[model samples]
Target: RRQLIRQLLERDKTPLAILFMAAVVGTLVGLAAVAFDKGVAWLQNQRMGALVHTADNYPLLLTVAFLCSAVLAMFGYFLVRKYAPEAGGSGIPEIEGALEDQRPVRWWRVLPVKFFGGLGTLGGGMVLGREGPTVQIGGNIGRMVLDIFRLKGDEARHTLLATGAAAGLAAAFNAPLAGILFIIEEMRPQFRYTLISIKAVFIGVIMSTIMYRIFNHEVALIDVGKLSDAPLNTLWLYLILGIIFGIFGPIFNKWVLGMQDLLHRVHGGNITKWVLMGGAIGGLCGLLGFVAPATSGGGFNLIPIATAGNFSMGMLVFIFVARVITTLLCFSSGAPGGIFAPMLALGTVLGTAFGMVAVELFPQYHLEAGTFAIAGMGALLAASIRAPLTGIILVLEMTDNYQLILPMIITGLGATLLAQFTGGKPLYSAILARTLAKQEA
Candidate 1:
């Protein structure tokens, strides 16, 4: 029996063991992401549904909404400020920092703070995303697993962290292929691309996606649904849109960093100042929610409405400008949230606008604005993040527009190429660089 056990242990001590461990990490990340999503939804429903039902008066409802959102945002800011400042913002930069050994991954503090704090901030209708927090938490979980298993080798730690991050993204969007591509394209600097490592990412994403589906059911995250594809003749139009995004993407990044610097200067490392700024932003979003609901929030609900052609060109442009400001303000406040979803919304709005104009000018082409919507969905992400493959796959997975893959690819590639030519470094890389510089200073 002892010899049999010994042989079994020895057999299990191959790369298969690491692969199995990666699968375990994936499962955990998926479960965590799903739970996080449900938790936020429950909080949102509880606050809005119950309060709105009883308020009955518009003024009272507005007041309650603002107060509720302010309180929730304050809670999130407090947690991040008091416990884990590094967990604030999209923690992807932190993960990149961790991989390079430039930033510490204090998983114990970051995990709980990010998970619950993110729930509060995002659920409060802040223009933020759950995916960023989930990815950071997922990577931390990977590190936790490594520590628990006493995995001493750097390779094991790096592979598992990458695997977990991919799994988290997959679970967030239920897009396994996109998750794999995200690692390959977005985290290419940190991700070691070997057959075994890539397979581990694939397996991890697959497992996480399956787990996510088990919880949320197999449904598309975004339902732009079956848009007509851009023809070869219309491809140049898409490129034109891409070029516009390429110009805007870097400018947007600059503004984001500028806002961050401005906030840092104003606060001067004061926690009270930071929290007050957060409350102010949250309250502003609440006000906007009452005045122009479409312009506020994370923009998830706005996608269907915009894609359905409900808004006029002027209204669309207004909402686009409003959202861009709100998104920049809320994200730049250093709240514990993500800019991923907001960026997607921005891309969709601008792309749809471009498409609408093209259709009007070239009425003979028979172009659908929604096709531009789909193409633009991934274009800004590619341009901003410089991860065209990941952007393309993410949109493909979320919208299930497999037939429009070519147009999506063209748009993403065009955005990336132009953005690169315009001297736009990747968003995550730039953020990581800034973090490292600050740490050194």
Candidate 2:
């Protein structure tokens, strides 16, 4: 009986099994992502609910907000520092490394640390993203399935890992096409594009997307209302925007890496100091949220506002710069958060600012600044991450404004080209290289 059980568990995993497992991984990752999202929302609502109406205790309420977020942030740091340090930051590099067989995937560790730890940081209203952690988790879940079935083969291990990653991104944003392209464009070097793997990725993304819709329903992720289309003549303006992003992209990447080094040196691997420092940054974010909520949080809430022209040009610029600083502070501290949404938010505001200026200068083009807003939304992502296709598709999927596809493509291409010319390294590649170097040392 024991032999029979073992044989059943170790049954040969065919291509059919691979596809079936991909579906399982997709459904599980999608459900997990929804739970994570709800967890953050619940924490934020509970904390804010208790504080907003307590106007009588203005100073006290503000202090409480800071402390609440601080504690939550510290908890996240503690989990990563103690259980899974690799779970820190965006986790995409770690996934890339794992796919390359350069890093180990300890799903048992990453799952809890990233889920609850990410909950703390994101819920604390830090300027971070859900997509990163979800991606990492999805990959880990794929490995988890691989182990549970006791599968022992190169193709089985390799295919599922890539499939899980694609599925995770699909679940996170409900953007199946972008998820598929991300695997192709962003992690192309690591992911083997065999027919089997490609089919697995498709199966995975489709399954996860269906699962996500069941939970959250089909809706545009960003909810930015429609705007005018880009004219052939104003295409040059997108190039201008992309050039601006191209310049900012490398600078932002450098700043992010610099902050990571600074925080690592300061903590020196001490868990207590590491967590305390993270708490300080989180506390500051909490304080900032109270004073100017626009500059705080993950920047999702700010996207629509920035695009709607609610703020003056000057205020937009101010928030753009201020959010850059805050986003860096929160992300650079090595928290279990992602820079994706924050970058998108920053790009939206910066793009909108540029658009506002365009209105003043190129009014004859009869341009809508919001049109530029959509173009600029993905420029920095394309430039910094150097995944032009993923950035463009992601923006289109999240916004549902397919009419601006031409401008989006142009802006993405322009940013990618200039970034390459400027010798700006791909963001995740740089980080993975750094991690490999550290591991070797």
Candidate 3:
């Protein structure tokens, strides 16, 4: 009735508009992600260059470091504080809220803010991940497309939104499966479910992936080489790890909400003050990135390093806590960033720590610590976001660790089961509820 556009086939396929729009979404998102990533890389390089060119002058090195990160981080805070507040803090929660009309998409604002703004946070070497931003940006692009094409019909609108989001996600991490899984797994809860929309998502993910690979290489984040296929007898280990997540998961969620409160209190409607203070924090974080590369940044490179036994047990523990602290600060302080990548990085650290300990205890099994790294990579995401399947698929896709299927399932299930029992609501839902509450207040 809307446009009479044809689907791939009548009964077996989706509409042409949705399909074509998906590719468009994919291309746009991939280009955006590539640019953001490349921009961040360039910024990081300058940071390194400044450190090198300091000529052994500690004061000068510190000054360059501080200003380099401070200026960019402050610029990011300024953009969100000035233009798009919705672009702040993982944007995933906002996208999830938008599906229910609990929040406005305002893609016109979000698109620019997320792009250049993300340039600030991520580019400044803050402790956050682009995966979440990419996902959020993708969803925003979907809505923008809907407006541009003047498409009508709930099914089409919802389908395109999800597809574009999927495309964005795929482009960001080179993991299309994760993007597709997020929409499908949260299909009903997100209020964007359409029975005939999957084809569009598939197309979108494909296009975005192609675009990403073109701009960037394969972008493999999870390669720890082949491990002995995880023995079934270790199911207990997997489940126990889940139990660990179940316990830690809720506690982590509590910390995040509390941290959000603390950050809000620190800034809260004070534009110049908050922006300046936020930049100060980001600058400190950047300094750490220089001194302790393992303890800062998004955590992708750290995954392999941590798993491959780069850092000692003590160092791993220290890095884990340090990064988590930074994640709590940077993510909660209303930065234009997301935690899924950081969370995955954190999970890997925790898992690697546990694995190192496990290896000492169960030397007879000859376990590869990286396998545990893989196993626990998605635990935080599963427990916190309450999307076990998405977490599982994301880890598998991100790391190419499909061989750990049993452990992945067991651990993810254990986390979800425990998180629910321990009063750990989904982080996005909780965060968004707070967002709406503040607006009303």
Candidate 4:
């Protein structure tokens, strides 16, 4: 009996078995991502739906929004502190560390903590994105599959982890190509890019994407509509936009880090203090949503509106600055959310503002501001995350606009080049470094 069990376990380490495991991971991650997306939306609806009834009474509306979000935010922070501290923040750093063997997956603890905690934080109207949590959850699902299957090889383990992450990103935005590029480019150093591993990543992305399309239907994530391409003469404007992002990128990173340090000092590892502070932040965001909806939340819905020139240049700048502050507070407080959507929103607003001004200045060019919005959307990701290809492909896929590919590439390159010169490391890498330092201490 013992020999038979050993033989069976050994057989599960075969290439075919690894591929099969990858499929399982992808399928599960797809389902999980869908559930997460729905879950957060449902929560938001519930909170906002109730708040709508109190709109007639100023006191009631203010009290309801603040208290409701405060409770939800407190619940999320408490769960992260009590059940799984690793579930805090963007979660990408933890996955990166896990890939390098510097951190443990702790899937059993992380899976539930992140899913439910995320529901609370994001649903409570905090300024955060879903992609990071989805990716982390997907990676945890990968680990769960590996453990359940009793896969005994390091290769199998590594492949499945990467597969789950790639699949997660694919499902998050329904961008399979960007998902693959993300694993290859963003996680290049930690990822073991063997042929088998690469194939597994591809399989995972395909499976997850198919699942996403089935539920969400065939639609682009961001609906900016088709815009005119940038003429060669107008391309320099993209460079300028990229340069602006490059300058802002390091400063933004610094703000995030500095804010984290400041918050940590205030909380002093006291779970109660952390939860209360998070509640206050959440309450503020909830109030902000009532007054200026575009300045809070993950910023997905804000993208199209901003690009459509719904707001004046002054309003765009105001929204951008306000969101930067809100984003810093919400994310830096160690909430279980992502910065991707918020950053994209920021890029769109600023880019549109720039484009609007340029349109007036260059009457002969016939340039559309929306094109710059698209380029800026990707440029910020490239500059801050330091993954030019992933950023470019992600925006291209999300917007379903192939005409702006050149501008996207150019903007991404310009952002990355200046960002590198400015000494800004990739956001996830920096967070991972901080985590490692804390672990060592």
Candidate 1 runs further than 4 Å off: 1-14, 190-196
Candidate number of the best lDDT: 4
Candidate 1 lDDT score relative to the true structure: 0.81
Per-residue lDDT of model 1, residues 1-441, tens digit only:
999998787652337767888988888898999989888788777666856575677777777777777888888888999999999999988887676666788888999999988877887778888778888988898888988888767668777888888898788777788888877767646545432278777777888888888888845567766777657887788778888888888888888888888878877888888787787787667657767888887787778677766678998999999988898778887887778788888888888898889889998889878888888887878888788888888888788778777778877888888888888879889898887887789
TM-score of 3: 0.94
Q: Candidate 3: where is the Cα deviation over 4 Å?
A: 1-13, 187-196
* lDDT to native, each model: 0.81, 0.85, 0.82, 0.87
lDDT of 4 by residue, 1-441 (tens): 999999788753438888888998999999999999888889888778888777688888888888888889999999999999999988888888777878999999999999999988898999998887889999999999899988987788778888898899889898899888888877545545432378778888889988888889955567978888668988899899899889888888889899999999989999999999999999887888888888888898889988887888889989999999999899999999988778888888988998898889998999778888988987778888788898888888888789888888888888898998999889889999988998789
Query: Tens digit of lDDT per residue, candidate 3, span 1-441?
Result: 534445423655667877787788878887777888899889988888888978597777777777888889999999998999889888887877776656788989989898889888898999888866787888888888889988888777777777777777677778788888887776334544345377788888888888788877744656777656787776788888888988799899989889988887877779898899888878987788877877778888888887787778998889888987988988988898888788998888888888888788888777877788888989998888888898888877766667899998999899999998888988888887888898999
Candidate 2, 274-322: lDDT as tens digits:
9999999887777788889988988878787777767798889789889
Kindly give the stretch of ten consecutive residues in candidate 4 with the minimal lDDT sum. Answer: 187-196
Off by over 4 Å in 4: 1-14, 188-196, 218-220
Deviation from native of the Cα of residue 327 in model 4, angstroms: 0.4
Ranking by lDDT: 4, 2, 3, 1
lDDT score of residue 50 within candidate 2? 62
Weakest 10 consecutive residues of candidate 2 by summed lDDT: 187-196
Q: For model 3, what is the error of residue 43's alpha carbon versus the real structure, in angstroms, after optimal superposition? A: 1.2
